[PDB]
Amino acid sequence: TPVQVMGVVNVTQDSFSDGGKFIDTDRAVEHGLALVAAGAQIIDVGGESTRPGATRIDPGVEAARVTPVIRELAAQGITISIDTMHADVARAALEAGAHIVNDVSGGRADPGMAGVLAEAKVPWILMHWRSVDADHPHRVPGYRDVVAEVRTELLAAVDAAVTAGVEPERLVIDPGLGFAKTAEHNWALLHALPDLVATGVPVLVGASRKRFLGTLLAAADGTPRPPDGRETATAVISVLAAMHGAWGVRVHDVQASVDALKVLGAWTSGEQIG
Ligand SMILES: Nc1nc2ncc(COP(=O)(O)O)nc2c(=O)[nH]1
């Protein structure tokens, strides 16, 4: 039972991050093909961003961006997750060939998401993000115990999914590192990863390039490490997550995490025989 490496393809970021004017399906498809060639088991396709100050787009535009990419990658037999909070977008992505729904709201953004998943009978990833104030969706709340509360709320989301008719075997949970959480919250959640794995629900970890790695690796004068300088740290997290029973890791740099997991595998089996 090896850890699943989930490589990220965001069609909007691929098309626009370096200044491009037009949506570029072919670039995103070639990106996904390259991540598969580098060892990804799952390609997570997204059309939106949730970070502060992102460009905001209609769900119709979100779907129009992801579905051509999903259609071409699915035609190559690739396993594809759709990274969306919007039920209508998830449904369109499933029509296009996605086989997993990755919901950073954990079903809380769209009351129709549970019904989409219950009907489609595909896996549903429920990420933890406590976001009571839509005017401040990233504000860090007061946790008495972030470890216990994340677990409680993820399992409550699992319960609501099952009540809606999703089969328990099809749920995945994700602690949502960095989403209304401090760096210290993240490290407590990661140290407690075995506890969350012990729920029996598959656990996905997404640490790749997140702000707490910029903080961890800050320069002597306080300047955080830029996102490109966070990849060694991200790959080490993939290894420690794998060692502690994570079902999957969500990463941008698939090659670096695959390299790291090959080291873990070669070390572990180094004295085996026969
Ligand atoms: N399940 C899951 N999905 C996610 N989707 C987007 C982002 C935002 O980060 P990005 O812009 O680097 O993709 N992070 C996660 C995460 O940690 N877990």
From the CB of 127, is ligand 1 less than 6 Å away?
A: yes
Backbone torsion region of residue 195, taken as left when φ is above 0, otherwise alpha when ψ lies between -120 and 50, otherwise beta: alpha
Resolution (A): 1.9
Which atom of ligand 1 is least distant from the CA of 178? Answer: 17
From 6, 25, 5, 1, select the one nearest 14 (Cα to Cα).
25
Backbone angles phi, psi at 200, to 5 degrees: 80, -5
Domains for the chain: give ranges and CATH numbers: 1-274 (3.20.20.20)
Using a 6 Å cutoff on CB, does residue 257 contact ligand 1? no
User: With contact defined as beta carbons under 8 Å apart, do 79 and 41 qualify?
Assistant: yes
Name the burial class of residue 184, with classes exposed (0-12), middle (13-18) and buried (19+) by CB atoms within 10 angstroms of its CB: exposed
Residue 241 near residue 187, CB atoms below 8 Å: no
Ordered strands of the 100-103 beta sheet: 171-174, 124-127, 100-103, 79-83, 42-46, 4-10, 248-251, 204-205
- The number of beta carbons lying within 10 Å of the beta carbon of residue 188 is 17
Beta bridge partner(s), residue 126: 103, 173
How distant, in Å, are the alpha carbons of 4, 108, 114, 167 from that of 121? Answer: 20, 19, 11, 8
Residue 183 contacts residue 215 (beta carbons within 8 Å): yes
Q: Where are the alpha helices (DSSP H) in 134-192?
A: 146-163, 183-191
If DSSP states are collapsed to H, E and C, what string results for 77-103? CCEEEEECCCHHHHHHHHHHCCCEEEE
Exactly one of 121, 210, 230, 262 is catalytic; name it: 210
Tell me the H-state helices in the chain: 11-16, 25-37, 59-74, 87-96, 113-120, 146-163, 183-191, 193-197, 211-216, 231-243, 254-268
Q: Whose CA is nearest to atom 4 of ligand 1?
A: 104
Tokens standing for 202?
């598959």
CA distances to 83, 139, 235 from 74, in Å: 15, 37, 27
Closest C-alpha to 14, from 63, 65, 67: 65
Cα distances from 209 to residues 39, 44, 177, 238, in angstroms, run 19, 16, 11, 12
Q: Are 68 and 27 in contact (CB under 8 A)?
A: no
CB under 8 Å to 191, separation ≥6 — which residues?
Answer: none
Angle at 131 between CA 65 and CA 79, to 5 degrees: 35
CB of 233 within 6 A of ligand 1: the answer is no
209 C-beta closer than 6 A to ligand 1: yes
Contact 251, 7 (CB under 8 A): yes
Q: Cα–Cα distances in Å, from 269 out to 68, 89, 152, 263, 272?
A: 42, 43, 36, 10, 5
Measured torsion, CA atoms of residues 52, 54, 56, 62, in degrees rounded to the nearest 10? -120
DSSP 230: G
CA distance 49 to 35: 20
Sign of the torsion angle spanned by Cα atoms 267, 183, 173, 103? negative
To 5 degrees, how large is the angle CA 181–CA 190–CA 151? 70
> Residue 107 carries which side chain, given as an amino acid letter?
G
Give whole-number Cα distances, 77 to 41, 74, 191, 251, in Å: 11, 5, 35, 20
